[PDB]
Amino acid sequence: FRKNSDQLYASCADFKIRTYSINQFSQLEILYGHHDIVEDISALAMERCVTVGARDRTAMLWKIPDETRLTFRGGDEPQKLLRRWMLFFCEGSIDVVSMVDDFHFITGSDNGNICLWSLAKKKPIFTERIAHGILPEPSFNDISGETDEELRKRQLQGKKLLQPFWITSLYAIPYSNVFISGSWSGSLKVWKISDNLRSFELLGELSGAKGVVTKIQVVESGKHGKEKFRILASIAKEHRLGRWIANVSGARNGIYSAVIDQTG
Amino acid sequence: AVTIRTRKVISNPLLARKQFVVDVLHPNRANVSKDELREKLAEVYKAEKDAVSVFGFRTQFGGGK
């Protein structure tokens, strides 16, 4: 929903975005340009909704009045990343997006990268690789049917079969410097954006959540100076779009809640 | 529903007016009459209908705009 407005933006698997007016109960416009399913969408007070197309690995910002769109692409390569260092995983798809600002937004991908974007620059301004860590290594008792343990270990191929956690959820409180990310790692990580909006750091973690964080929301109450923030996250045993993820030990279906106070 | 957008808005005090390009989206509709567009533009700009003029409307091939 466009903030403080009746305009709704719907992303569809037919590679199109549909806009509705709930008060008039009517469809207004279809937006074209994505080459794969539009997985997630976010909006703020302005009509500038942003979207991510999953496997096409492109984030698009739509200027509905101007009838123009801005295309953002990651374009990162492990070869250069490793050489400059002298485990980096190539980006597969962008699954989540949230608008920090009318001129800034963040995205989360299946390689565990959390990227900060600016409308001025097509490339990311800052990236946080493997944000939620690496998946547990597969058990050697299950990889192979060999009796000898060393043979089973060789099938693990060292660290080559290790893959990162996906960013299943990503939410930024509007017009603030804090956003929350989620996965099935078992914790919600809270990040803080720099004052110049050129970087961010890990503020903390909330380990109560166990399972797949499908969606995150934040609500605040109290006086202007003194505000309590409640983080509500839907937790599930399976990913929202499909049943690919192997059953996570201890995962449960429920609503995760965390009330946070401000003092200083 | 019908959407009306104005773009390339120029304030022209030489002729005492505002000039713009009007894009009309009318899904599942043949087109929007000049009278109805004038009414809605008058509401949008907070001006009398008599002060609103619209012309030169060409429908896009395939319809809908």
């Binding site: 207004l28 | 104005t6 773009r7 808005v9 120029i10 304030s11 809605k40 700009y45």
Partner: peptide, 23 residues
Amino acid sequence: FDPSPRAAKKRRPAAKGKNLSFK
């Protein structure tokens, strides 16, 4: 040693687009 008035500042346009929906 190398031997080598300002133009008027540009203005953001006064008017912007307006959008409405009906029916």
